[PDB]
UniProtKB/Swiss-Prot annotation, chain A:
Protein's UniProt name: Ribosome biogenesis protein UTP30
InterPro entries: eL8/uL1-like, Ribosomal_uL1-like, Ribosomal_uL1/biogenesis
Record text on subunit structure and interactions: Component of the 90S pre-ribosomes. Interacts with FAF1.
Keywords carried by this UniProt record: Nucleus, Ribosome biogenesis, rRNA processing
Domain of life: Eukaryota
GN (gene name): UTP30
PANTHER family cross-referenced by the UniProt entry: RIBOSOMAL PROTEIN L7AE FAMILY MEMBER
Function in brief: Involved in rRNA-processing and ribosome biosynthesis.
Matches recorded under Pfam families: Ribosomal_L1
Similarity comment text for this entry: Belongs to the universal ribosomal protein uL1 family. Highly divergent.
GO biological process: maturation of SSU-rRNA; maturation of SSU-rRNA from tricistronic rRNA transcript (SSU-rRNA, 5.8S rRNA, LSU-rRNA); ribosomal small subunit biogenesis
Taxonomic classification: Eukaryota, Fungi, Dikarya, Ascomycota, Saccharomycotina
Major subcellular location class: nucleus
Annotated organism of origin: Saccharomyces cerevisiae (strain ATCC 204508 / S288c)
Other information: Present with 3060 molecules/cell in log phase SD medium.
Curated annotation (Swiss-Prot), chain B:
Disulfide bridge positions per record: none
Residue list for modification Phosphoserine: S57, S62, S63
Coiled coil: none
Species the sequence originates in: Saccharomyces cerevisiae (strain ATCC 204508 / S288c)
Subcellular location: Nucleus, Nucleolus
Miscellaneous information on this protein: Present with 3670 molecules/cell in log phase SD medium.
Ranges of biased composition (kind: Acidic residues): 57-63
Biological role stated in the UniProt entry: Involved in ribosome biogenesis, probably through modulation of rDNA transcription.
Similarity comment: family membership: Belongs to the RRT14 family.
Name of protein: Regulator of rDNA transcription protein 14
Superkingdom classification of source: Eukaryota
Curated annotation (Swiss-Prot), chain C:
Membrane-crossing segments per the record: none
Protein's UniProt name: U3 small nucleolar RNA-associated protein 16
Designated gene of the protein: BUD21
Record region (Disordered): 28-60
Biased composition (Basic and acidic residues): 38-52
Section of the entire sequence shown: 155 to 214 of 214
UniProtKB/Swiss-Prot annotation, chain D:
Native organism taxonomy: Eukaryota, Fungi, Dikarya, Ascomycota, Saccharomycotina
Family, per entry: Belongs to the UTP11 family.
Gene (UniProt): UTP11
Swiss-Prot/TrEMBL keywords: Nucleus, Ribonucleoprotein, Ribosome biogenesis, rRNA processing
Protein's GO biological process: rRNA processing
GO CC annotation terms, alphabetical: nucleolus; small-subunit processome
Protein name: U3 small nucleolar RNA-associated protein 11
Length: 247, 63, 60, 141, 228
RNA sequence: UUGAGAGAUACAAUUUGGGAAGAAAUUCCCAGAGUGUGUUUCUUUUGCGUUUAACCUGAACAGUCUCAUCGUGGGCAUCUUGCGAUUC
């Protein structure tokens, strides 16, 4: 419909408006009628993009926060040659708290373009990594598994790090976008980029996003928006919310 | 013979519909055999929301 | 084509079909039951045969 | 502690066999009918032999003849009767899973209670890690 | 409340309430003889459950021609303490006298004390391999059902049924493979037993596997022709 | 990697059969079976190499003294967070 026209005027002004010269990410926001009941945690649920990959993982600075011993977490992923040219720097959580503290979290925010941590110590993160990261979802810390094996009740944790399968996760997590569920209706997803691709690529990125978010089946990662979407609004991080899908 | 056979079919549909288990044909047979004889973490409840669905292209594309 | 021919021979020589859950066995004649001794079965004679012809004694 | 656990266990055991008393278990055996001729062997159909309909044949708890073929007092029984019949099976299953849980619970302190009495104890250890206790061969007077 | 339904076999019913049971009309009102439940719906009834009655598993598995009939005489071979002899008294009514035989003394005291209450059953306490030893009592019983567990089941039928049975009569026998062989397949045991009955002028009609109640058991029914 | 036997059967082939409507063919409630390609579990036929295995037992846990059982104290929430069971 007019979604191509709305993206056309947004692309035209963002290289022309002096205020919008710096924001390079494109967001669609979703306001629903009912409020989805799950409050805002800090684990970002990711969604796939079935046709067009967003980013390949060899153009983003990737910081990994691992467990406290961190010997074979560092050793295996650096000397496997599946992930050797992938990770930028690996830090243990106790060493991250001790080394990077104060105003150095700002330069850690600016220099490193994406942050991901294991499921072990991700909940401990926001009191050592700072409130600058939790201003929206630009550098919200993403999710990776480490072992591809589970822990039952009273079973000893067997430590294993398979680099191929955690490389495939970073392939599966940089190729697409993610949503963070919220208490109120307004949630925003970052679909596409200004110069990575163009308007027909963003248009089917919109369609695959609203297909996954409105899926009445596939509950725990997809069944978040219930009923129907009232509207969707395409925007940059500093532009206005241009309207599409009025009803 | 249509008059007598319809009355037999009427009594047959009266019993067979009211003395069966259509949707319970599986559960009442599995429980009768027991009577006669997405990864989930234990301690972190945020395992299944945030994990990336690994596809075959993510295991193959060396790029 | 003779592999299909003795397959058909096994079809008419069979005497037990399983009609659904139910099964039907053919009953043999009374004169064959009384005037003929019963068949030996393979489990009782081959147990004796390969015990006598076991490889622990160098037969043959 | 051992007396209480077996008392709950024998309560669930007695309610199990009382729960098996009024329950119905459908039979599916090898019901086989002998025949005397090959011409009746291959023309056999159970609807022909039992002279009744096909849906009447497959039920084994009763199989009424077409002469005997000549409902909803438990009202809306399409959802009420089958669910409530399933709930009696569910309660017997909850009787059984509580009973075998109480059996494993009782055995774990009964080995502990016999561990305290007398004799020369010796703790053996299985290669899988399952511990036990083997005793000396001393005749207690 | 309970929806009632007569069986294919006459004289035995199925009580289809919220729970389901197999049930028989009482003959002795207000008296259960081993602790069994009942439904009064009027006529007072009595329940069966196949886990101790080997005839009841034959009923519930589906028997084509139950020769036990509501007006026919029944020879109960192997009366194990009246646990099912009282049940076949309820299904044949006061019309034909049902005969029960047994050897042991513990069922014998239970049989006589329960046949005091029930005039349908007459108990015999003599060996079932010697039908001449109680020849003073029976003449052509209308059917015989066997539940013996002594390894001459075919002979103990052929001894009794050759001179105590009506011509073109029905013979029922419970046979289990754990009694007789207990080391081969069950189906070959029952295949041995039907040719055993075929030599005794009995044409075997139906054999049924009693699988959900009595493991390794069976019920054979059939016709008996042209002697006695 | 063989010789057959016995099935759950995944797709198709007109059927076999009870009931209903099919004036003329259909087609439904169904109940199965048979056939080929599957896919198969197990029984024996089969040849070579190997006569040793597996389990239990005798006075066979214990001076680095061990094992119970009740308590106490501290670790592991970046998780053996602990069952009338044994987290160390």
């Amino acid at each position: 419909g007019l979604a191509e026209k709305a993206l056309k005027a947004l692309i035209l002004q963002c290289e022309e408006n002096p205020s919008l010269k710096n924001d390079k990410d494109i967001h669609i926001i979703i306001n629903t009628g009912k409020k989805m009941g799950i409050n805002r945690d800090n684990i970002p649920r990711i969604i796939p993009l079935t046709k067009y990959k967003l980013f390949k993982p060899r153009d983003l600075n990737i910081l990994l926060i691992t467990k406290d011993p961190s010997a074979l977490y560092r050793e295996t992923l650096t000397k496997d040659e599946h992930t050797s040219e992938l990770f930028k720097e690996i830090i243990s959580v106790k060493n991250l708290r001790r080394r990077f503290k104060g105003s150095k979290l700002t330069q850690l925010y600016k220099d490193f373009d994406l942050v991901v941590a294991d499921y072990r110590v991700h909940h401990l993160l926001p009191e050592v990594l700072g409130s600058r990261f939790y201003h929206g979802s630009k550098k919200l810390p993403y999710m990776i598994r480490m072992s591809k094996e589970v822990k039952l009740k009273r079973q000893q944790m067997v430590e294993k790090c398979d680099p191929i399968y955690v490389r495939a996760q970073l392939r599966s997590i940089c190729k697409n976008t993610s949503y963070i569920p919220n208490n109120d209706n307004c949630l925003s997803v970052r679909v596409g980029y200004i110069q990575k691709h163009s308007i027909p690529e963003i248009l089917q990125n919109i369609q695959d996003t609203i297909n996954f978010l409105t899926d009445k089946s596939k509950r725990p990662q997809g069944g978040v928006i219930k009923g129907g979407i009232i509207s969707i609004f395409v925007k940059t991080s500093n532009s206005t919310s241009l309207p599409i899908y009025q009803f | 013979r249509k008059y007598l056979n319809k009355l037999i079919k009427r009594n047959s549909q009266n019993l067979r519909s009211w003395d069966l288990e259509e949707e319970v044909r599986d559960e009442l047979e599995d429980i009768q055999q027991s009577i006669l004889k997405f990864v989930k973490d234990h301690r972190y409840p945020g395992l299944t929301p945030g994990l990336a669905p690994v596809g075959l292209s993510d295991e193959e594309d060396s790029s | 084509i003779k592999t299909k021919k003795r397959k058909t021979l096994k079809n008419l020589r069979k005497d037990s079909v399983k009609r659904g859950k139910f099964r039907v066995q053919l009953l043999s004649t009374t004169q064959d039951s009384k005037t003929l001794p019963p068949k030996k079965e393979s489990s009782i004679i081959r147990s004796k045969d390969r015990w006598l012809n076991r490889k622990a004694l160098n037969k043959g | 502690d051992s007396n209480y656990v077996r008392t709950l266990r024998q309560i669930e055991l007695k309610k199990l066999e009382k729960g098996a008393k009024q329950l119905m278990f459908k039979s599916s055996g090898n019901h086989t009918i002998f025949v005397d001729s090959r011409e009746k062997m291959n023309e056999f159909t159970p609807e022909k032999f039992f002279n009744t309909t096909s849906e009447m044949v497959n039920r084994s708890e009763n199989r009424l003849t077409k002469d005997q073929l000549a409902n909803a007092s438990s009202i809306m029984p399409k959802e009420s009767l089958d669910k409530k019949k399933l709930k009696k099976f569910k309660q017997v299953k909850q009787h059984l899973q509580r009973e075998t849980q109480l059996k494993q619970v009782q055995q774990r302190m009964d080995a502990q209670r016999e561990l305290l009495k007398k004799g020369s104890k010796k703790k053996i250890v299985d290669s899988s890690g399952k511990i036990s206790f083997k005793w000396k061969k001393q005749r207690k007077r | 409340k309970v929806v009632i339904e007569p069986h294919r076999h006459a004289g035995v019913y199925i009580a289809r309430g919220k729970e389901d049971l197999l049930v028989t009309k009482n003959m002795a009102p207000g008296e259960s003889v081993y602790g069994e439940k009942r439904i009064s719906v009027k006529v007072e009834y009595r329940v069966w459950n196949p886990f101790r009655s080997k005839l009841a598993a034959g009923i519930m598995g589906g028997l084509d021609e139950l020769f036990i009939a509501p007006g026919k005489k029944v020879l109960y071979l192997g009366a194990a303490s009246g646990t099912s002899v009282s049940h076949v008294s309820d299904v044949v009514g006061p019309e034909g006298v049902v005969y029960a035989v047994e050897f042991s003394h513990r069922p014998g005291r239970e049989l006589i004390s329960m046949a005091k209450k029930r005039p349908n059953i007459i108990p015999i306490i003599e060996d079932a391999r010697h039908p001449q030893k109680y020849r003073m009592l029976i003449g052509m019983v209308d059917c015989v059902f066997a539940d013996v567990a002594q390894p001459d089941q075919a002979r103990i039928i052929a001894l009794n049924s050759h001179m105590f049975l009506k011509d073109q009569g029905g013979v029922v026998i419970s046979i289990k493979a754990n009694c007789i062989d207990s080391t081969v397949d069950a189906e070959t045991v029952f295949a041995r037993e039907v040719q055993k009955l075929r030599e005794e002028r009995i044409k075997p009609l139906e054999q049924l596997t009693l699988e959900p109640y009595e493991r390794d058991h069976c019920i054979v029914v059939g016709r008996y022709m042209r002697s006695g």
